[PDB]
Design a protein around this ligand. Sequence first.
Ligand SMILES: Nc1nc2c(ncn2[C@@H]2O[C@H](COP(=O)(O)OP(=O)(O)O)[C@@H](OP(=O)(O)OP(=O)(O)O)[C@H]2O)c(=O)[nH]1
Ligand SMILES: Nc1nc2c(ncn2[C@@H]2O[C@H](COP(=O)(O)OP(=O)(O)O)[C@@H](OP(=O)(O)OP(=O)(O)O)[C@H]2O)c(=O)[nH]1
Lengths: 270, 269
Amino acid sequence: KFRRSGRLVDLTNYLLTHPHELIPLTFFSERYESAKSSISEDLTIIKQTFEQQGIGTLLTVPGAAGGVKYIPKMKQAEAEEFVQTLGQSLANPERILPGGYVYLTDILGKPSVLSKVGKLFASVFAEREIDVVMTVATKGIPLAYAAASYLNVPVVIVRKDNKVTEGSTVSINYVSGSSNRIQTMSLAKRSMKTGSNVLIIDDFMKAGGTINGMINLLDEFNANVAGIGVLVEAERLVDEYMSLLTLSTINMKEKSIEIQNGNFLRFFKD
Amino acid sequence: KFRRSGRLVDLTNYLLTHPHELIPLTFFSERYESAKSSISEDLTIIKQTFEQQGIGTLLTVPGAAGGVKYIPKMKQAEAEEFVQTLGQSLANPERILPGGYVYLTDILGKPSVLSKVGKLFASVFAEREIDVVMTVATKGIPLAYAAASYLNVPVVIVRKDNKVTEGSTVSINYVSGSSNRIQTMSLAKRSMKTGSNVLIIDDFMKAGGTINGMINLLDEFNANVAGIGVLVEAEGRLVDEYMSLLTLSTINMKEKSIEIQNGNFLRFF
Ligand SMILES: Nc1nc2c(ncn2[C@@H]2O[C@H](COP(=O)(O)OP(=O)(O)O)[C@@H](OP(=O)(O)OP(=O)(O)O)[C@H]2O)c(=O)[nH]1
Ligand SMILES: Nc1nc2c(ncn2[C@@H]2O[C@H](COP(=O)(O)OP(=O)(O)O)[C@@H](OP(=O)(O)OP(=O)(O)O)[C@H]2O)c(=O)[nH]1
């Protein structure tokens, strides 16, 4: 069957792979052929270790329709050290592109980096009620999936083309600050339940025209924005958002990227 | 310092979050302030439990240059049952779209499905030399990042635009079987090192002209095809060796009927 040593390894792996799911104690008890009191002490050790190591926390919801829920969390210390390292790598002037753009797609591709950004996002929005994570194609998509895996919620991708083949669609128009052109963004009607609570994730925000377009698109679904998370904000039509980094405009002459913290610390108060 | 119980929990978490990394036994000795004799006892328990529970294999390589490595693996039974499960739910007649297309957007969006498809891909290609996972925007991107996270390699996204502003780009042309139009797919030059071993991941293959486009694009970088993996292949093929989970028989738009069976994935077990 299972001795205690293996039971803890399996318990640890089951929790880590089912974050934000409520598991009844009888599930573990029947699985390891052990008493619910022995399971509860194993969950006490996992709890203390998760907290000490900065992995997360275990919530116990009481009652027969209760159980345990693993919640990924990030300590403020690991958060600002990681954001500091991130900003230092984004500071590289080799990333400067024509038009004052910054090359970040190597960073959005590394697995270690994405899992920590996704964990950070999930840590900050852990206690909101999120049905779905939403972003717009294309570069926001890795971030959206990292965050959604820790939160255990589907991802919805807003498309800027009505090229697509995925059934009936709803589109709106929005003004970016860029092309002050009116671009269009769209979403399949069958890809989001109406009334859902949406966490919006995106790679980058300047004055927020794209995110505000996502907000108005949610109105057409009678959905609610549970939160807004952005990796980089430029130095604003939007409301409350969390940002990891702040980018001061690229001085294209001096070849200089200057980046500081975002407002993320505001969300780590003891 | 940790007692044995907290050490097992931390050790499990650390291994699960650092797959395919050779970790020296001395890293854990300094970490936990304990002998390599005690840590080797814990690795032995984790190894047995990872293997019994279908989580993966814990490979111990001796020597100073060696250590411990966690390799995500899927057992055949779990692969058979998950693929059958996925196959039936995709054979839902509501998924049929105008033009004979099949709506996958919801499946490719759920986190628990993606982690098992990603783990399946990573289990089959676990022993191959891979520097990077590559896919085409947009729907392949979830599968590619799922598989890459288990393999611990970066992800590279081929754009069917050339619009994109990420520096100097290499573009090629290719013919779909669809629009027998010649479309264009591009790849930034600073997003791929010369001679990279590339695992191609996509959501759907019919004739293979998109995947064949990606292979042609890899030669402009003198990169190699480490492997090709697709969620769904259509019946009836310019491509070489690939792995598929599902096969889709053309939607009889008259009958309202999607017919789907297993792919070729069993031949890798
Ligand atoms: N320097 C830099 N900019 C980025 C990066 N990623 C996105 N941007 C830009 O930020 C802006 C996104 O903000 P939006 O949500 O579109 O809101 P906005 O219309 O008010 O600008 C876009 O620039 P834009 O305002 O839409 O037009 P433009 O300034 O490029 O001419 C987008 O091109 C990056 O990595 N580095
Ligand atoms: N039924 C269905 N088909 C999909 C779906 N997603 C992509 N396809 C089709 O699969 C094909 C992509 O495979 P390719 O790699 O391009 O293979 P190919 O060039 O030899 O045709 C495209 O059609 P095509 O092979 O170029 O021609 P056609 O069969 O669409 O007429 C594409 O339209 C889907 O979700 N459902």
